[PDB]
Amino acid sequence: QVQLQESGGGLVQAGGSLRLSCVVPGRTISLYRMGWFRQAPGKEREFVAGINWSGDMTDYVDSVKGRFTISRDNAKNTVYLEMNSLKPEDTAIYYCTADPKLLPLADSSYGYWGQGTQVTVSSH
């Protein structure tokens, strides 16, 4: 019954923007951490951004600092990932994640995983 509904991915030219969205139906107070991980073929899965339940603490992988912003709207049970200045190395499957544990947002101990959304940054 814990569903992470992902949207917002697709194909985008380098320098362009996207907004990923992760909607969790129901009562999400127990999920203190929510975030995004990404994995491209042949590379290891990687933390991208995370946020706490109150929406006032965040963290990011260094390669996206200054380009991505994660935010949380509990009134709509949604976490958003605004992705600006996209680069080809941002190409990957992006996964919404959630976890109850009161650990650092970047600690890769997340127990709930979305099915993933493809993001492709073209340089043609």
Side-chain angles (χ1 to χ4, degrees):
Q1 181 168 25
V2 171
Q3 299 178 299
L4 306 182
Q5 301 173 328
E6 300 148 310
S7 65
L11 176 64
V12 59
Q13 191 75 18
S17 296
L18 295 175
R19 189 226 250 178
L20 305 189
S21 150
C22 181
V23 177
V24 185
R27 180 191 179 70
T28 65
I29 176 62
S30 69
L31 302 175
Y32 182 67
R33 305 186 288 157
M34 285 191 67
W36 293 90
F37 282 70
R38 71 184 170 183
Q39 190 169 24
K43 298 192 182 300
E44 296 190 351
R45 191 191 252 174
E46 191 182 29
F47 173 79
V48 178
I51 194 161
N52 69 347
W53 187 65
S54 52
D56 56 340
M57 285 301 293
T58 62
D59 198 10
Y60 301 88
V61 67
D62 284 322
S63 61
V64 309
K65 286 180 176 175
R67 306 193 292 117
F68 297 4
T69 309
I70 187 169
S71 63
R72 188 161 185 165
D73 178 347
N74 288 328
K76 291 180 179 184
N77 299 30
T78 303
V79 175
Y80 302 95
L81 184 62
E82 294 196 1
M83 304 180 286
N84 304 325
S85 308
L86 282 162
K87 309 181 174 184
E89 48 267 292
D90 295 318
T91 298
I93 303 290
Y94 284 69
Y95 305 93
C96 176
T97 66
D99 197 69
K101 289 188 290 299
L102 314 183
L103 296 175
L105 297 172
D107 192 78
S108 31
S109 51
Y110 286 77
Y112 296 98
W113 292 81
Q115 290 291 310
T117 186
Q118 175 67 44
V119 173
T120 303
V121 184
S122 179
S123 56
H124 286 323

PDB file of all heavy atoms in Angstrom, residues 1-5 23-25:
ATOM      1  N   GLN A   1       0.801  -1.220   0.000  1.00  0.00           N
ATOM      2  CA  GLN A   1       0.000   0.000   0.000  1.00  0.00           C
ATOM      3  C   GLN A   1       0.838   1.277   0.000  1.00  0.00           C
ATOM      4  O   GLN A   1       0.306   2.365  -0.212  1.00  0.00           O
ATOM      5  CB  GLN A   1      -0.926   0.015   1.225  1.00  0.00           C
ATOM      6  CG  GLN A   1      -1.850   1.227   1.330  1.00  0.00           C
ATOM      7  CD  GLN A   1      -2.936   1.075   2.390  1.00  0.00           C
ATOM      8  OE1 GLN A   1      -2.791   0.318   3.352  1.00  0.00           O
ATOM      9  NE2 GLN A   1      -4.028   1.811   2.219  1.00  0.00           N
ATOM     10  N   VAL A   2       2.143   1.157   0.222  1.00  0.00           N
ATOM     11  CA  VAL A   2       3.028   2.310   0.093  1.00  0.00           C
ATOM     12  C   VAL A   2       3.385   2.443  -1.383  1.00  0.00           C
ATOM     13  O   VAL A   2       4.173   1.658  -1.913  1.00  0.00           O
ATOM     14  CB  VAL A   2       4.281   2.175   0.965  1.00  0.00           C
ATOM     15  CG1 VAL A   2       5.275   3.280   0.620  1.00  0.00           C
ATOM     16  CG2 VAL A   2       3.901   2.230   2.441  1.00  0.00           C
ATOM     17  N   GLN A   3       2.849   3.472  -2.032  1.00  0.00           N
ATOM     18  CA  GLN A   3       3.049   3.694  -3.456  1.00  0.00           C
ATOM     19  C   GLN A   3       3.795   5.002  -3.666  1.00  0.00           C
ATOM     20  O   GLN A   3       3.441   6.029  -3.074  1.00  0.00           O
ATOM     21  CB  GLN A   3       1.705   3.715  -4.183  1.00  0.00           C
ATOM     22  CG  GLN A   3       0.927   2.404  -4.067  1.00  0.00           C
ATOM     23  CD  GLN A   3      -0.419   2.449  -4.757  1.00  0.00           C
ATOM     24  OE1 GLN A   3      -1.283   3.252  -4.409  1.00  0.00           O
ATOM     25  NE2 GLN A   3      -0.604   1.584  -5.745  1.00  0.00           N
ATOM     26  N   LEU A   4       4.847   4.950  -4.479  1.00  0.00           N
ATOM     27  CA  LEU A   4       5.618   6.134  -4.860  1.00  0.00           C
ATOM     28  C   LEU A   4       5.358   6.393  -6.341  1.00  0.00           C
ATOM     29  O   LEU A   4       5.979   5.766  -7.200  1.00  0.00           O
ATOM     30  CB  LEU A   4       7.104   5.918  -4.590  1.00  0.00           C
ATOM     31  CG  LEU A   4       7.472   5.485  -3.173  1.00  0.00           C
ATOM     32  CD1 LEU A   4       8.972   5.356  -3.002  1.00  0.00           C
ATOM     33  CD2 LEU A   4       6.881   6.466  -2.162  1.00  0.00           C
ATOM     34  N   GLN A   5       4.479   7.343  -6.638  1.00  0.00           N
ATOM     35  CA  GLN A   5       4.026   7.577  -8.011  1.00  0.00           C
ATOM     36  C   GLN A   5       4.920   8.633  -8.649  1.00  0.00           C
ATOM     37  O   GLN A   5       4.893   9.799  -8.242  1.00  0.00           O
ATOM     38  CB  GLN A   5       2.558   8.006  -8.036  1.00  0.00           C
ATOM     39  CG  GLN A   5       1.605   7.004  -7.412  1.00  0.00           C
ATOM     40  CD  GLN A   5       0.188   7.527  -7.307  1.00  0.00           C
ATOM     41  OE1 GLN A   5      -0.029   8.725  -7.123  1.00  0.00           O
ATOM     42  NE2 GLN A   5      -0.783   6.638  -7.423  1.00  0.00           N
ATOM     43  N   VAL A  23       4.532  11.312  -5.838  1.00  0.00           N
ATOM     44  CA  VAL A  23       3.300  11.447  -5.070  1.00  0.00           C
ATOM     45  C   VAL A  23       3.123  10.168  -4.269  1.00  0.00           C
ATOM     46  O   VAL A  23       3.311   9.061  -4.796  1.00  0.00           O
ATOM     47  CB  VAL A  23       2.098  11.703  -5.996  1.00  0.00           C
ATOM     48  CG1 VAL A  23       0.807  11.766  -5.215  1.00  0.00           C
ATOM     49  CG2 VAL A  23       2.314  13.005  -6.765  1.00  0.00           C
ATOM     50  N   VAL A  24       2.824  10.317  -2.981  1.00  0.00           N
ATOM     51  CA  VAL A  24       2.597   9.198  -2.081  1.00  0.00           C
ATOM     52  C   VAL A  24       1.179   9.300  -1.528  1.00  0.00           C
ATOM     53  O   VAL A  24       0.907  10.105  -0.642  1.00  0.00           O
ATOM     54  CB  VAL A  24       3.634   9.161  -0.942  1.00  0.00           C
ATOM     55  CG1 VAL A  24       3.443   7.912  -0.095  1.00  0.00           C
ATOM     56  CG2 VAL A  24       5.046   9.222  -1.509  1.00  0.00           C
ATOM     57  N   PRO A  25       0.244   8.491  -2.026  1.00  0.00           N
ATOM     58  CA  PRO A  25      -1.122   8.566  -1.493  1.00  0.00           C
ATOM     59  C   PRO A  25      -1.162   8.147  -0.031  1.00  0.00           C
ATOM     60  O   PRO A  25      -0.411   7.274   0.413  1.00  0.00           O
ATOM     61  CB  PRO A  25      -1.910   7.585  -2.376  1.00  0.00           C
ATOM     62  CG  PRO A  25      -1.063   7.394  -3.611  1.00  0.00           C
ATOM     63  CD  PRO A  25       0.356   7.523  -3.132  1.00  0.00           C
TER      64      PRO A  25
END
